[PDB]
C-alpha cells in the first residue's frame, strides 16, 4: 500500500525562538547539525506534540529534561526526516527514535493477522536488544503497541510466538531476524519505519551483508534512522545507500 504518512511535527508556537537562542543550546549541549531544514530542538516535552498516553509515561519516569539526543532527535523523526545520530555508545538514543515510532504507528491501520512489524530496530547484540525493549515496554504497555526482542541467544519458541501473535515493533539482531525471514515466521512488508542502532558495531561484527539483505526487503521510501558512535567511511557509505536527504546530528565528537 504505497499510501503512507510520516508527518511533520508542527512546533507549537511556544517553540518560536529562531534567534541564535538555539546555537546557544546546541553549543551548550555539543550538538552539531548538518542537513537541509534541520528543525529546532525541543526543550520541553510539551513542545513536542506527543499523545496523552506517552507524555504520561514520562512524568512517571520522573524526567528532568529531554537530553541533547532527544531534544534535537525527536523533532527530526517527528518530521519524517531521515537522520544519522552520532553519539557515544550507550547514550540515551532509544527513546529518541522510539517515541516518534509510536506516533508513527498510530497514523496507520491496525495489524492484520500475518502482517509483520511496522517499526524495525536493528541492534548489534542481545545486550542492546533487551535494553531497547525495556525502555519501550513501558510505552507499549501504555498503548496499543506490542513489542518484542529477537536474538540468537534464547528459545526461538517464545520469539516466534510473540511474532505469531503479531507485534507493531520489532527489535532484532541481524542474523537472528534473517533466519526468521526466510522461514515464514514474519515479514517486512509492513515496515515503513527502520532504525539501526550502533551500526558502527554492526559493521565490525560482519553483519553488513545480512543487514543489506534485510533493508533490500524494505520499502525504499521508508523512514530510516541510523545511530553510530563513530563515523568511518563504512558508516557513511551505509548511510548513503540507506538514507536520503538525511539530517546529520552530532553529539559525540
Swiss-Prot record:
Glycyl lysine isopeptide (Lys-Gly) (interchain with G-Cter in SUMO) crosslink, residue number(s): 2
Modified residues (Phosphotyrosine): 246
Covalent cross-link site, Glycyl lysine isopeptide (Lys-Gly) (interchain with G-Cter in SUMO1): 2
Location of the Helicase ATP-binding domain: 74-249
Sites where the protein binds ATP: 63-65, 70, 87-94
Cross-link Glycyl lysine isopeptide (Lys-Gly) (interchain with G-Cter in SUMO2) mapped to chain: 2
Record protein name field: Probable ATP-dependent RNA helicase DDX5
Organism: Homo sapiens
Residues of the full protein shown: 52 to 304 of 614
